[PDB]
Design a protein around this ligand. Structure first.
Ligand SMILES: O=C(O)c1ccc(NC(=O)c2cccc(CC3CCCCC3)n2)c(Nc2ccccc2)c1
Length: 191
């Protein structure tokens, strides 16, 4: 099981337009979110690879911590990290932890899917957020996603998160066991 952390772009995938980047301040009222949301690849519902453990408002923006739990995805990505020249081409030579470096490089973006700002201004009936996506394109704000084996290590990699914010974040993360989370639906494309 891997952990992922970083600051999200807040998007509401629209039907008419190509993309809509929300200002984080439009959703802070609905944070924090400590119930598990799916983590997918590029907003594709069939690519669940894990679950969020917390969405938090911090000084520097909206910070997300999640767990990558899909066995099919972890096995595939680990094999690629040790054997694929394509996966290793855009990363530094001979990394000590190739899996982490390859996710860090190939999926640097975290995007939080929100309902349209129309309902955010009023009183929403249902959930405001649907999922978080690991993304290869469309990154707007600075900083990139961090992947690691230890949650504390992931969050501490962000100097823009204070000691107080890290302690609040890690309280919820440690309060959840990944065993009683359902298996994500990701299927290896090689099948
Ligand atoms: O079915 C097909 O024809 C097909 C073709 C291309 C695909 N993926 C891509 O083109 C692509 C681009 C950027 C980032 C990623 C994610 C990342 C996962 C594990 C380490 C290496 C890559 N995939 C995918 N999807 C996919 C591939 C590998 C892992 C996960 C999803 C499918």
């Amino acid at each position: 099981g891997l952990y992922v952390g970083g600051f999200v772009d807040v998007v509401s995938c629209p039907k008419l337009e190509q993309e809509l980047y929300l200002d984080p301040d439009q959703v802070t009222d609905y944070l924090p979110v400590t119930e598990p949301l799916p983590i997918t690849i590029e907003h594709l519902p069939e690519t669940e690879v894990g679950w969020t453990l917390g969405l938090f408002q911090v000084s520097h923006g909206i910070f997300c911590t999640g767990a990558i739990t899909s066995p099919a995805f972890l096995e595939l990505a680990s094999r690629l990290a040790d054997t694929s020249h394509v996966a290793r081409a855009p990363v530094k030579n001979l990394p000590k932890e190739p899996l982490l470096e390859i996710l860090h490089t190939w999926l640097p973006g975290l995007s939080l899917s929100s309902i349209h700002p129309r309902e955010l201004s009023q009183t929403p009936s249902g959930p405001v957020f649907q999922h978080v996506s690991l993304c290869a394109l469309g990154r707007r704000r600075g900083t990139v996603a961090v992947y690691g084996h230890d949650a504390e290590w992931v969050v501490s990699r962000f100097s823009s998160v204070s000691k107080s914010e890290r302690a609040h974040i890690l309280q919820h993360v440690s309060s959840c066991r990944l065993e009683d989370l359902s298996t994500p639906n990701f299927v290896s494309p090689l099948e």
